[PDB]
RNA sequence: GUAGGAUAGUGGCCUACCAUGGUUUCAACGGGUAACGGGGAAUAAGGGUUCGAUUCCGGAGAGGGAGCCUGAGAAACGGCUACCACAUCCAAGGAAGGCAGCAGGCGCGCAAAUUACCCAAUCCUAAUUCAGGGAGGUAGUGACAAUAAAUAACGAUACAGGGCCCAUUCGGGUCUUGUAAUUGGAAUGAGUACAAUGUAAAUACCUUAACGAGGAACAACUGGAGGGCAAGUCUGGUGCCAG
């Protein structure tokens, strides 16, 4: 029917980053869209890499289904992948977890507040408490 | 602050509006090669105009001497590739008079109709618009594509969609459903 | 005849000077230079100006065609000067009313009169934030009073 | 009146429910047909928008 | 000019003493600029003319003018000290200020956007792989400007134009074109929408399933219709009026 014809164009082996980085080229004949997980699986099957250390991004399919042309790396290990790849990518993959944090504006406000106070806040709190009577 | 993305108000209006004969000619041209507007014609003229200007410039220097020889030659080659220039004519002074009609004739507009496929210019255009026709195996839906001559034999109906014959296509499906129901 | 201007190979400065001198006979150039638009010309050398409708005034037309041309005495907001703006199409003056804000435009002639309406230099365009043509059409409606 | 008398005086005739003259390229095609393909009749001279033949 | 003073240093930069020079119709000096300079922009035969606040390079300025600390580097203004002009907070004794950063408001005006999301990129700073960054990007608004182009297409039957086997009158119409609220099959993406793509996260794009076109819509406006100048000696309403 289709068979998800995957290729790996422009393979640069990277001893510095500890990976094989490349352009993922992939075909759909009559299927439409490849899916990322599937692509990863395919890569693993090809390269003996395992999804854990495969890492893909970019793409945008050509026009009129058919083809898709993304960017894929295959690290020398899982650990290596973890300690080099940006966090967003990891999150996308499922490997890492989403970093739960406050809003940027909120953070900024907090920082400002901190700047405004001096020393330890405990003292300030104590002072406030004391005032409470007044 | 990145850099100004450049553009050209490429495709330029004529200096008088209502030169009646000219208008008529334009209309005729449109009829011949099924255009939505005079705009397209104007664009074509501009394209050709530029080429003409270039040719003139080249002439204004000595053929034998370098820039003229090389740049001009390159231009000629490009023209040939496009398929507006003939193979008999590759002498620069032939480019000088190319004409807009020729340019129009090289479009994926007409290179559908010229190769059969459609039946009646407008129809071809419509087909092109509606996600049929793949010059390679990549679906062109610009009428004013300009076919490469080297890839004119390769103009087919689309791999996907009907006419090429992958899927029948929507109305047909509906009809089938109706039949089934019956 | 050598024909006036010096044709010497080193007579360039003189020529330039002459040209400059001549430039002050050309009217547009002069205007550009002296800032007649910036110093006079009710508007501030601008395309448009908002102005207050002081009163509706019918002005009697020039000659040949004889009629009353339903103009408005407008006071420009930014400068404070007082001008007379013709009001286009049928009626229109009613729509404009009295004491309304009114966005003026030039009539066409880079200043000057416009055909038959004597001592009149401006089209009313918008009345209190709409557009006169639109109102006339009734494609758009007025925002009440 | 003495302030847009003529606009108020006229009878409002209504837009007749006619079929759309098609947009974009269709119109152009139609124009072409009118012009060079069909060829209008001429006693001696061409005319784009003729009259009903009368004084 | 001589000498000193100062300066990181040259130097009337400043001081002392002396000389009388210095510039100028090859426009000095003064006045104006709705003048920041240049790269460049618009126009575009050749020569030109106008514009250049504004993505790059320089220069200035941080309400005005002044003065200075620290520092390699500031005469810094998201440093200080003063005065003017403006203004806040007050228990009246006193305090704090400076959006020509970003966002936003008033104000002015013909005239210009969100008090959004983030450091993933781009680069930058430090004690510095690690933090920060309204620099920067990301969307939002956005008909500034620019590019690409949907707004039916193919049928059949039904009424007319064109080729004509032959034109004793016809006519079949064997062949090709245009018109009908006929009708019929074949797509379509503009819309929507699982998904997957994107992405810092999102949107949107590209990719798709599913629904979604038949004049009632899944509807093109603007201007014009005597000339200049493309196109109405059409019909009524008007009757120097209103335009
Ligand atoms: Mg499709
Ligand atoms: Mg008269
Ligand atoms: Mg000295
Ligand atoms: Mg300037
Ligand atoms: Mg200035
Ligand atoms: Mg500048
Ligand atoms: Mg200014
Ligand atoms: Mg600058
Ligand atoms: Mg200010
Ligand atoms: Mg300062
Ligand atoms: Mg500030
Ligand atoms: Mg600063
Ligand atoms: Mg601001
Ligand atoms: Mg604007
Ligand atoms: Mg910014
Ligand atoms: Mg919008
Ligand atoms: Mg489209
Ligand atoms: Mg109209
Ligand atoms: Mg009219
Ligand atoms: Mg009319
Ligand atoms: Mg005419």
- Chain C residues with CB under 8 Å of D7 CB are 90-91
Burial, D3: exposed, middle or buried (Cβ in 10 Å; 0-12, 13-18, 19+)? middle
Q: Among all residues of chain D, which has the CA nearest to that of C68?
A: D2
Dihedral (Cα; B50, B54, B59, B64), 10-degree rounding: -150
- C94:D3 CB<8 A: yes
Q: DSSP string spanning A79-117?
A: HHHHHHS-HHHHHHHTSS-------HHHHHHHHHHHHHS
Q: Are strands C122-127 and C82-86 parallel, antiparallel or unpaired?
A: parallel
Q: Chain D contacts of C135, Cβ < 8 Å?
A: none
Q: Which tokens go with B166?
A: 């992958």
Binding site as annotated, residues of C for Mg(2+): 64
Query: Is A67 strand, coil or helix?
Result: strand
Cα dihedral across residues B74, B75, B76, B78: positive or negative: positive
E strands present in C1-145: 48-57, 71-76, 82-86, 101-106, 122-127
Identify the CA nearest to B109 among candidates B143, B150, B157: B143
Q: Quote the ligand 15 centre to A26 CA distance (angstroms).
A: 39
What is the C-alpha to C-alpha distance for residues B44 and B50, in angstroms, rounded to an integer?
A: 10
The ligand placed nearest to the CA atom of residue B1 is 15
Q: Which nucleotides of E are covered by protein (CB under 7 A)?
A: 26-27, 34, 43, 50-51, 55-56, 108-111, 116-121, 132-137, 145-155, 178-179, 181, 184-189, 195-201, 205-209, 212, 215-217, 219-220, 222-223, 225, 229-234, 236-243
Domains located in chain A, CATH noted: 1-134 (3.30.70.3370)
Give resolution, Å, one decimal: 3.8
Half-sphere exposure of A69 (CA within 13 A, CB side): 6
> Which distant-in-sequence residues (6+ apart) come within 8 Å of A10 by Cβ?
A22, A23
User: How many domains would you assign to chain D?
Assistant: 1
Token pair listed for D34? 């009118």
Pick from A80, A76, A113, A114: nearest CA to A95 = A80
Asked if C43 contacts C51 with a C-beta cutoff of 8 angstroms, the reply is no
Among D5, D3, D6, D9, residue whose Cα is nearest residue C57:
D3
B117: closest CA of chain D, how far (Å)? 20
- Per the entry, the structure determination technique was cryo-EM
Range of the structural domain that residue D36 is part of: 1-55
CB nearest D29 (choices: B28, B37, B122): B122
Touching, B vs A (3+ Cβ pairs under 8 A)? yes
Gap between the Cα atoms of B109 and A9, Å rounded: 34
Q: How far apart are CA A10 and CA C143, in angstroms?
A: 65
Whole-angstrom distance, CA of residue A106 vs CA of residue A89: 25
Residue of chain A nearest B130, judged by CA positions: A64
């Amino acid at each position: 029917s289709d068979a998800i014809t995957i290729r790996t164009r422009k393979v640069i082996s990277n001893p510095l980053l500890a990976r094989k980085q490349f352009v993922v080229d992939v075909l759909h004949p009559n299927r439409a869209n490849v899916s990322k997980d599937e692509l990863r699986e395919k890569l693993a099957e090809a390269y003996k890499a395992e999804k854990d250390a495969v890492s893909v991004f970019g793409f945008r399919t050509q026009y009129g289904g058919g083809k898709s042309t993304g960017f894929g790396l295959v690290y020398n290990s899982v650990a290596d992948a973890k300690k080099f790849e940006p966090a967003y990518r990891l999150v996308r993959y499922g490997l890492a977890e989403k970093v739960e944090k406050a809003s940027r504006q909120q953070r900024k406000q907090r920082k400002n507040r901190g700047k405004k106070i001096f020393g330890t806040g405990k003292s300030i709190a104590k002072k406030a408490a004391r005032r409470n009577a007044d | 602050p990145r850099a100004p993305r450049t553009y050209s108000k490429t495709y330029s209006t004529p200096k008088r509006p209502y030169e009646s004969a000219r208008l008529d000619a334009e209309l005729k041209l449109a009829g011949e090669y099924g255009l939505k507007n005079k705009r397209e014609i104007y664009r074509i003229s501009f394209q050709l105009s530029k080429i003409r200007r270039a040719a003139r410039d080249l002439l204004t220097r000595d053929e034998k001497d370098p820039k003229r020889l090389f740049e001009g030659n390159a231009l000629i080659r490009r023209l040939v590739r496009i398929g507006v220039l003939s193979e008999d004519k590759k002498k620069l002074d032939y480019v000088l008079a190319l004409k807009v009609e020729d340019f129009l004739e090289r479009r994926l507009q007409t290179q559908v109709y010229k190769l059969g496929l459609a039946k009646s210019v407008h129809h071809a255009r419509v087909l092109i618009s509606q996600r049929h026709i793949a010059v390679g195996k990549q679906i062109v839906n610009i009428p004013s594509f300009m076919v490469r001559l080297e890839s004119e034999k390769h103009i087919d109906f689309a791999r996907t969609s009907p006419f090429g014959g992958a899927r029948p296509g929507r109305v047909a499906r509906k009809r089938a459903a109706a039949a089934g129901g019956e | 005849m050598g024909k006036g201007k010096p044709r010497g190979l080193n007579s360039a400065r003189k020529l330039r000077v002459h040209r400059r001198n001549n430039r002050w006979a050309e009217t547009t150039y002069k205007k550009r230079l002296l800032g007649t638009a910036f110093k006079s010309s009710p508007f501030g050398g601008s395309s448009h100006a908002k102005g207050i409708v002081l009163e509706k005034i019918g002005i009697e037309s020039k000659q040949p065609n004889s009629a009353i041309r339903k103009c408005v005495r407008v006071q420009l907001i930014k400068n404070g000067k007082k001008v007379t703006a013709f009001v286009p199409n049928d009626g229109c003056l009613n729509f404009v009313d009295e004491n309304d804000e009114v966005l003026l435009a030039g009539f066409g002639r880079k200043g000057k009169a416009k055909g038959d309406i004597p001592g009149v230099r401006f089209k009313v365009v918008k009345v209190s934030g709409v557009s006169l043509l639109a109102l006339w059409k009734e494609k758009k409606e007025k925002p009440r009073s | 009146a003495r302030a847009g008398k003529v606009k108020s005086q006229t009878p409002k005739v209504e837009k007749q429910e006619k079929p759309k003259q098609p947009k974009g390229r269709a119109y152009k095609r139609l124009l072409y047909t009118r012009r060079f393909v069909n060829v209008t009749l001429t006693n001696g001279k061409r005319k784009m928008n003729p009259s009903p033949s009368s004084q």
